[PDB]
RNA sequence: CGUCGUCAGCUCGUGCCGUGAGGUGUUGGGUUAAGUCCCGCAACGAGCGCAACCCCCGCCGUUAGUUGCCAGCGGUUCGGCCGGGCACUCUAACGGGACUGCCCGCGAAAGCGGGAGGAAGGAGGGGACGACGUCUGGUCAGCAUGGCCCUUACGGCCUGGGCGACACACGUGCUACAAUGCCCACUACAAAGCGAUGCCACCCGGCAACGGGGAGCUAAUCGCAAAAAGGUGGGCCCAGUUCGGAUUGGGGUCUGCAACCCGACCCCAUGAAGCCGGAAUCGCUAGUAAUCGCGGAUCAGCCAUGCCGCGGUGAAUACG
């Protein structure tokens, strides 16, 4: 009936609820394209489905909070990736090799003292 | 001029605070100033007893002052006369019905603050610095301890050229957190100027 | 910290404005914190002693 | 890079043509991490080359690049109180780099007010064998060769 | 049905305080809402390490305030007894409303 | 772009010391340290010595300057 | 630009409000 | 406290060598980010440093539900609003996780290359931490301190001024010179923080700054708070221009005893230089650089475009 995952990216989490259907996608009560209004990135999010010829056999209700649009795009990518294996572990075999099942760890590096921002160091003259 | 305080560095683990009391942005600064004022009269008084630490717990107008010493008797007095006078001097400073426990030190040669004070004294009594040091490091090393180390500042023996005398035995890993190294600093007023003593005592790990 | 100037404690400011803080430990007027009534120096010092409850070395 | 030899970042295939070389070109176009704005510019240009031309934009792209790659260049060097333009063969990895960089550089030199148009024209204009991008590529090759006398300084 | 607040500077001073309550009144009142962990409010102090100049060293200090809830429903009679006056933690502060 | 609000400030030091010097005619000089005070109508015709920080400067206040401050006429620094 | 106080960015940058950027 | 420099390295004990200063060990071969580990060796070990123990970030679990939700259902002023439920998200304590363990290849080893399973792979990413010592480094104006010197003044109090001068020169930055842009709308998506005589919802007045009234929060519960860059639509059409916002003239609003010297803010008018910068020179190896906004400390107010942090979008390149 239902299949869950989660997916997190650059500090942005997303609820991914898969269900057998057409290809309808509700993100925070909006059509995928309604939410990702002209952000060339979007397509990516659903990439895990196309990977296993799905999309044309599934439907998805997505809730998302935290971070920013493109970070949410990835959270959804991982949620949908997990939910797909939640429906069938055999999906890993070929879904994994494309990475989809890995959580991107890189996050905003901390701002150190003495620098202008983590690494950018102050400019010095007549040294 | 490097390396952090070995205690402030170890407050997370192997080391607790000397004041355990919650407060809000309206009180904190006060219960603090006071909490200090306490250590003020106390350390200026109980000196001879050899006060190694003064913990201060609070609850609500309740003050659990716990003067730690090597000679718990100088605290008390004749029968119990001092721990009466002072205990009253305290509540006089801050009307807060203050307790005033007293604890003895199971070996004052493992109380970094004391060892510092000891050596710091010998200096004003015009002793040979290096001797004092080597000795202290010995006392500590003898009565247990897995390592120890003493440091004296400069103007040794009234010299115009300030120096710095060493001395140490066994392990004393300042870098390792779970070291549990007691540390103590003793001043040293003089006819010619100030000197500074630092005491390090390494005991146990994990 | 001239003793004469640590008269700041003197409520009587004549005009509430003129009243300013000072380190309650060193008299330092130049960089005193409110939540401690202590300057950045005295503050760093006591924090090391462990005499500032709850205050730890922040890392992240 | 004193220790290792730095492995090349592997890019994510194009969102539309599933090409990695496209993402690159897009990246080079992009400034201040406005990858959206970047991507669109390239694409609109793709549709501009799609109109004024009957050929597929993807193929026009590939060609231009291929035409703007330098196969030789002079790398300056020190030899007994003197600097010499030493002709050097050009690494495949560096060719693609210089090609994509140059196109965009040349492109933004153009007069047409609209970004995508400038990329559009420069790109197609390139596959035609003309365009400032290709002129740079040629000047470089002319630079090299023209110093073949200092070629024995293999480097 | 009592709502209690538990704030502090030590996170073990509060855990050995919220449970100091729950378990006790866990055998005389409702099954309780268990101890709920309220987010923490951190207070940072950033200081120039040395006394003079050197504005590029700095050391960081934070005073983190932890919080709890518990919340037992059914303000029973046998509850306010296993509790009431059997306190232990000293670095804690407690608020009560219901 | 100047502005105070409502209450054209004036140190009463001289005010009630000038509005009074109006009754018995005028006078000759009024040295002040309050250059903070706003010049006002009933000052016109008078002569206020304003302290610049080292000396008191003679200032024949006239209609054309009824809204300005007293310091504005006692320049502080000495240049070239 | 951020230096134009009579514009949106002007206000935002200067963290103020007014005709050119009223509080919603 | 800064600095060489998180750079490794600096030493001891006993033995051995040398008349002696001293040497050996710590050199050598392999290998590491590392005096890291291996192998060898008249040395065998140890100490201070490396590393590890502490913190943050990444995957999962177990108590624990005044913040999550039709996930599943019943109500609908379609506001997770109400009932309701802890699954999920979180919030925050405690644990699990990685060991070059497994497979292959190369070694004698330590290890090196590669492959699997895994959120993560060979110090996963960032931090705290900076040895014996050097610079007669810095600080007597944080404080402490030996010695000198003044003690109706080199002490103390005020009111005013100065620290805010300017022919001129440099450092660090800010805002720009525009169309990959600027303007006006409409609409999205954060994280950390701060707030009871303090944040200030909402309402009315005013072009507005702000006034007047006033609900709420001891604050996962109320407020600061708009997110901006984005996305959508529309305007400008290459011009010193709808670029840029310096300077100056007005008229106001706040804080404050008081804004002349010497405050920030608002509105009208003004609309400077500036068309990408000589010689020379700085930063950064990835969630970094570059861009975008947000908070905080200090603080009445502010001269912050400074510091210290926070999150969004997110490159290029390294032969050598
Ligand atoms: K020196
Ligand atoms: K100008
Ligand atoms: Mg950033
Ligand atoms: Mg700086
Ligand atoms: Mg003094
Ligand atoms: Mg003030
Ligand atoms: Mg102050
Ligand atoms: Mg500074
Ligand atoms: Mg403008
Ligand atoms: Mg290292
Ligand atoms: Mg030897
Ligand atoms: Mg010889
Ligand atoms: Mg011999
Ligand atoms: Mg030797
Ligand atoms: Mg050696
Ligand atoms: Mg040697
Ligand atoms: Mg040798
Ligand atoms: Mg070692
Ligand atoms: Mg080596
Ligand atoms: Mg050896
Ligand atoms: Mg000197
Ligand atoms: Mg110097
Ligand atoms: Mg002195
Ligand atoms: Mg100055
Ligand atoms: Mg001049
Ligand atoms: Mg600046
Ligand atoms: Mg209105
Ligand atoms: Mg002013
Ligand atoms: Mg011009
Ligand atoms: Mg132009
Ligand atoms: Mg680097
Ligand atoms: Mg700011
Ligand atoms: Mg302020
Ligand atoms: Mg100013
Ligand atoms: Mg600011
Ligand atoms: Zn201080």
From Swiss-Prot, chain C:
Entry-linked InterPro entries: Ribosomal_uS14 (IPR001209), Ribosomal_uS14_bact (IPR023053), Ribosomal_uS14_CS (IPR018271), Ribosomal_uS14_sf (IPR043140)
Molecular function per GO: rRNA binding; structural constituent of ribosome; zinc ion binding
Keyword terms, alphabetized: Metal-binding, Ribonucleoprotein, Ribosomal protein, RNA-binding, rRNA-binding, Zinc
Presence of the UniProt keyword Zinc in the record: yes
PROSITE patterns tied to this protein: RIBOSOMAL_S14
Record's keyword annotation contains Oxidoreductase: no
Cofactor: Zn(2+)
Textual note on the cofactor: Binds 1 zinc ion per subunit.
Gene Ontology BP terms: translation
GO cellular component: cytoplasm; small ribosomal subunit
Binding residues for Zn(2+): 23, 26, 39, 42
Annotated HAMAP family: Ribosomal_uS14_2_B (MF_01364_B)
Function: Required for the assembly of 30S particles and may also be responsible for determining the conformation of the 16S rRNA at the A site. Binds 16S rRNA in center of the 30S subunit head.
Family, as annotated: Belongs to the universal ribosomal protein uS14 family. Zinc-binding uS14 subfamily.
Quaternary assembly: Part of the 30S ribosomal subunit. Forms a tight complex with proteins S3 and S10, which cover it.
NCBIfam families per UniProt: PRK08061.1
Name of the protein: Small ribosomal subunit protein uS14
Lineage of the species this protein comes from: Bacteria, Thermotogati, Deinococcota, Deinococci, Thermales
Record gene name: rpsZ
Curated annotation (Swiss-Prot), chain D:
Recorded superkingdom: Bacteria
SUPFAM superfamilies: Ribosomal protein S7
UniProt function note: One of the primary rRNA binding proteins, it binds directly to 3'-end of the 16S rRNA where it nucleates assembly of the head domain of the 30S subunit. Is located at the subunit interface close to the decoding center. Binds mRNA and the E site tRNA blocking its exit path in the ribosome. This blockage implies that this section of the ribosome must be able to move to release the deacetylated tRNA.
GO cellular component, one term: small ribosomal subunit
Name the UniProt record assigns to this protein: Small ribosomal subunit protein uS7
Keywords noted in UniProt: Ribonucleoprotein, Ribosomal protein, RNA-binding, rRNA-binding, tRNA-binding
GO molecular-function terms, A-Z: rRNA binding; structural constituent of ribosome; tRNA binding
Gene: rpsG
UniProt record similarity statement: Belongs to the universal ribosomal protein uS7 family.
CDD domains: uS7_Bacteria
Xref: PROSITE patterns: RIBOSOMAL_S7 (PS00052)
Organism: Thermus thermophilus (strain ATCC 27634 / DSM 579 / HB8)
GO biological process: translation
Name of a matching Pfam family: Ribosomal_S7
Assembly behavior: Part of the 30S ribosomal subunit. Contacts proteins S9 and S11. Binds to the C-terminus of IF3 and to the C-terminus of Era.
UniProtKB/Swiss-Prot annotation, chain F:
GO cellular component: cytoplasm; small ribosomal subunit
Keyword RNA-binding: yes
Range of residues in the leader sequence: none
Keywords of this entry: Ribonucleoprotein, Ribosomal protein, RNA-binding, rRNA-binding
HAMAP family noted in UniProt: Ribosomal_uS19
Described function: Located at the top of the head of the 30S subunit, extending towards the 50S subunit, which it may contact in the 70S complex. Contacts several RNA helices of the 16S rRNA.
Protein name: Small ribosomal subunit protein uS19
UniProtKB/Swiss-Prot annotation, chain G:
Listed GO CC annotations: ribonucleoprotein complex; ribosome
Record note on quaternary structure: Part of the 30S ribosomal subunit.
Protein name per the record: Small ribosomal subunit protein bTHX
Organism: Thermus thermophilus (strain ATCC 27634 / DSM 579 / HB8)
GO MF term list: rRNA binding
Disulfide bonds: none
Transmembrane feature ranges: none
Cross-referenced Pfam families: Thx (PF17070)
Basic residues bias locations: 1-12
Organism superkingdom: Bacteria
Record region (Disordered): 1-24
């Amino acid at each position: 009936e239902q299949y869950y995952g989660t997916g997190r990216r650059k500090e942005a989490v997303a609820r991914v609820f898969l269900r057998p259907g057409n290809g309808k996608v509700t993100v925070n009560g909006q059509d995928f394209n309604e939410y990702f209004q002209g952000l060339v990135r979007a397509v990516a999010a659903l990439e895990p489905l196309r990977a296993v010829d799905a999309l044309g056999r599934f439907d998805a209700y997505i809730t998302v909070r935290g971070g920013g649009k493109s970070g949410q795009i990835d959270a959804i990518k991982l949620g949908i990736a997990r939910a797909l294996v939640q429906y069938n572990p055999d999906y890993r075999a070929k879904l994994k090799p494309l990475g989809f099942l890995t959580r991107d760890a890189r996050v905003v590096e901390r701002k150190k003292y003495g620098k202008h921002k983590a690494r950018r160091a102050p400019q010095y003259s007549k040294r | 001029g490097n390396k952090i305080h070995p205690i402030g560095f170890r407050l997370g683990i192997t080391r607790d605070w000397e004041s355990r009391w919650y407060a809000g942005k309206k009180q904190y600064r006060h219960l603090l100033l006071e909490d200090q004022r306490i250590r003020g009269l106390l350390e200026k008084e109980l000196y001879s007893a050899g006060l190694a630490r003064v913990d201060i717990e609070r609850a609500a107008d309740n003050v659990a002052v716990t003067v730690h010493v090597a000679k718990p008797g100088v605290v008390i007095g004749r029968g119990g006369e001092r721990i009466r006078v002072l205990r009253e001097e305290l509540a006089k400073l801050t009307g807060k019905n203050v307790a005033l426990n007293v604890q003895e030190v199971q070996n004052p040669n493992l109380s970094a603050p004391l060892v510092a004070q000891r050596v710091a004294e010998q200096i004003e009594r015009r002793f040979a610095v290096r001797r004092a040091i080597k000795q202290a490091v010995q006392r500590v090393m003898e009565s247990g301890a897995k390592g120890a180390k003493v440091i004296v500042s400069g103007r040794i023996g009234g010299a115009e050229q300030a120096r710095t005398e060493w001395a140490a035995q066994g392990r004393v890993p300042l870098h390792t957190l779970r070291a549990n190294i007691d540390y103590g600093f003793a001043l040293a007023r003089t006819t010619y100027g100030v000197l500074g003593v630092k005491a390090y005592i390494f005991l146990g790990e994990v | 910290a001239r003793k004469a100037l640590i008269e700041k404690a003197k409520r009587t400011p004549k005009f509430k404005v003129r009243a300013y803080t000072r380190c309650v430990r060193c008299g330092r007027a130049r960089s005193v914190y409110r939540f401690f009534g202590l300057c950045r120096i005295c503050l760093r010092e006591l924090a090391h002693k462990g005499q500032l409850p709850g205050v730890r070395k922040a890392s992240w | 890079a004193r220790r290792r030899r730095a492995e090349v970042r592997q890019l994510q295939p194009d969102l539309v043509y599933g090409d990695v070389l496209v993402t690159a070109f897009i990246n080079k176009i992009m400034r201040d991490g406005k990858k959206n704005l970047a991507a669109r510019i390239f694409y609109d240009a793709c549709k501009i080359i799609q109109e004024k031309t009957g050929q597929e934009p993807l193929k026009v792209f590939k060609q231009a690049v291929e035409n703007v790659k330098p196969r030789m260049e002079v790398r300056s060097r020190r030899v007994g109180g003197a600097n010499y333009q030493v002709p050097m063969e050009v690494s495949p990895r560096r060719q693609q780099s210089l090609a994509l960089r140059w196109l965009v550089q040349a492109a933004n030199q153009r007069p047409e007010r609209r970004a995508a148009v400038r990329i559009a024209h420069e790109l197609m204009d390139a596959a035609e064998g003309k365009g400032g991008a290709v002129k740079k590529k040629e000047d470089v090759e002319r630079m090299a060769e023209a110093n073949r006398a200092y070629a024995h300084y293999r480097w | 049905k009592i709502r209690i607040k538990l704030r502090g500077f030590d996170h073990k001073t509060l855990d050995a305080s919220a449970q100091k309550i729950v378990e006790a009144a866990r055998r005389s009142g409702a099954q309780v809402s268990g101890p709920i962990p309220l987010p923490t409010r951190v207070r940072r102090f950033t200081v120039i390490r040395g006394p003079f100049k050197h504005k590029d060293s700095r050391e960081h200090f934070e005073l983190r305030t932890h919080n709890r809830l518990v919340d037992i429903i059914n303000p029973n009679r046998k509850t306010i007894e296993q509790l009431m006056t059997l306190d232990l933690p000293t670095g804690v502060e407690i608020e009560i409303k219901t | 772009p100047r502005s105070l609000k409502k209450g054209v400030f004036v140190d009463d030091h001289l005010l009630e010391k000038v509005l009074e010097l109006n009754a018995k005619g005028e006078k000759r000089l009024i040295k002040t340290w309050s250059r903070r005070s706003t010049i006002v109508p009933e000052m016109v015709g008078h002569t206020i010595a304003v302290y610049n920080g080292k000396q008191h400067v003679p200032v024949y206040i006239t209609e054309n300057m009824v809204g300005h401050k007293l310091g504005e006429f006692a320049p502080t620094r000495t240049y070239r | 630009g951020k230096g134009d106080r009579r514009t949106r960015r002007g206000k935002i940058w200067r963290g103020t409000y007014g005709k050119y950027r009223p509080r919603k």
